[model samples]
Target: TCGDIPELEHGWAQLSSPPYYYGDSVEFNCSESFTMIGHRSITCIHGVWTQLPQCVAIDKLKKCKSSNLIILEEHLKNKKEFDHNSNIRYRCRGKEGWIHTVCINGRWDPEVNCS
Candidate 1:
């Protein structure tokens, strides 16, 4: 029987038909959002995987969150440009409030207020 085949290993390979007396072909495939790094196809000539396949996750580059809130300060002379992955802390000129925010990737996170 096909199940009795000692050479068959790994559930990725299977006989194309019954009896298993002829040279049956086996096919391998990976799920979506992934790629077969190793062998994409293999044959079951001797009831085995014949070729090994490796699946890897698709690359999704890291990016900063979009949309940033502007901190309007009446005492500031000009607005500053904060690069990505940077942080800035500010205190109100004559008030008792503090502001802080961080820039990630190529954008800045939402401004945080502290009193």
Candidate 2:
């Protein structure tokens, strides 16, 4: 058996009442203006839940559009797309040493100022 999975940031799940255990399948849904890009469902197996999809903004579905910034997440190196409300760290290629950014409404907020 596994503990209750964390709630999705911009989405919710159906058939997720409680007591989640092995072989339980949960269906995920996105907000009205958000789009689901991956599998809409996940199954709990071996006390672990399978990969969960993300809810990205439909209009802000474009990939991060920044330059001269270094991505910080170990598993996010090749991750091109990002979900809304996702937080990330960056190392500016300028005078700034380190800064953080977050995805909001499909766009990274607080645009990096490396000057």
Candidate 3:
């Protein structure tokens, strides 16, 4: 069985800059060691992109970095629950990075990494 693929929806759009008018372009690329096999660039027309883009795996049965990770738990109502919502926030203890994840619906939500 293959894993899920990442896709970029509406990869093109238009932009306005001052008194000068220029065409707009957008490109989608995967991270290092990954490959994007679909349309890499899209043009802006009618306020939208003409095509979408997709990212595919270069190797079959290879493990890629997960975009989501769980990291916290708390006791609530006499039960332990994961807090993934903004209401419950967590920071990496003794770690030198931003808060990476949250618990929601008894599970850890994806981490929002610092850019």
Candidate 4:
């Protein structure tokens, strides 16, 4: 008998997965202002819910365009992509320590400054 899988605080869950113990498959739902990216199910397997990927969304899960030439400081190790609404820290690298960048419609928002 497995316990309840768990609930998403920031997001909502419904339309499918249930029956605690064997398996619970669910239809992940995000807020009106979010974007969901996953298999669409909170699967139950092997007694672990690690099966659930990120049922989260975004202001928009945007990243900086390759041509933009601006890198985030929080995760300066990589410049390929970043999360939406991510507090990009920078100024030669994580200087401001914490600055958030917004994403809109699957694209990076304005202000690519790290100073």
Candidate 5:
């Protein structure tokens, strides 16, 4: 038996067969709207576990919460380009202070009612 392998973050991997023999293969799968990184399948050879794929979330910020949409510097700044864990600046209406939003895993981290 090749023994049990650990699951991947933001995704899942299922064994092709039971007993996990020396040449067993495993199929990789990702959650909804997520992309799979690395190999799709890994094989166990000579009691060695192979490299498993990873699942990463896709950019859905365009379809994310629309309430956060607002104008920035006289221009509509919705759907701005951002990367993972990138900080976005925003200022709510009728306010003097400012707040920040972070792009997390291809989606907005959270919210603070800034529009």
Candidate 6:
């Protein structure tokens, strides 16, 4: 059994039932003013949850116009161009995990700054 329901930022989930047993399906809904970018429903299979969706702000989405959104940024390895409301993962020195940053409105949100 999958331990607990996965979490979604700026969104919530409604489980069909309990205990998170196999074949349990969960429905996800985004908050007002946010747009969902992936599957709204997922199932628990083999102790793992299916791919989860993300909720992006409606006002934050814009055409990616800048080619140098992350100019020679440390710890990031990605293409110069990206789609609007996308994500890129990077690693920081002394940081434990690969931190993910999002591209919103042509700017990199939560700017990556590793000291």
Q: Could you tell me which 10 consecutive residues in candidate 4 have the lowest summed lDDT?
A: 65-74
Question: Residue-wise lDDT of candidate 2 within 1-115, one digit each (tens)?
Answer: 6768755667887768568878888888785777775668888888888888787656657656444455445655556666655677666555354577876544676664555
Off by over 4 Å in 3: 1-22, 59-115
Residue-wise C-alpha lDDT for candidate 3, range 1-115, written one tens digit per residue:
1112223532322232322212445556655444444467555555554455544344421222222232233432232433223343333444444444443333334433322
lDDT of 6 by residue, 15-106 (tens): 65568888887888676777666678778998977877777776656544333322434433445555555676644566667566676555
- What's model 5's TM-score? 0.45
Q: Estimate every model's Cα lDDT from 0 to 1.
A: 0.42, 0.67, 0.38, 0.51, 0.59, 0.65
In lDDT terms, how accurate is model 5?
0.59
Which candidate should be chosen as best, given lDDT against the real structure? 2
* Model 4 segments more than 4 A misplaced: 16-18, 53-57, 63-115
Tell me which of candidates 2 and 3 scores higher on lDDT: 2
Clashing pairs in 5: none
Worst 10 residues of 1 by lDDT: 2-11
Local lDDT at 24 for model 6: 80
lDDT of 6 at 28: 83
Candidate 1 lDDT over 1-115, as tens digits, reads 2322322222243334545443544455445654444455554465453554554442321233322233334442244444443455444445355455554433434443323
In candidate 6, which residue pairs get closer than 3 Å at backbone N, Cα or C atoms, i.e. clash? none
lDDT of 4 by residue, 1-115 (tens): 4556666645676664345555656656665666555544576667755344354556445554422334445355465555554445433244444444544334544555543
TM-score of each: 0.31, 0.49, 0.30, 0.43, 0.45, 0.49
For TM-score, candidate 2 versus 4, the one ahead is 2
Candidate 5: 10-residue stretch with minimal lDDT: 65-74
Clashing pairs in 2: none
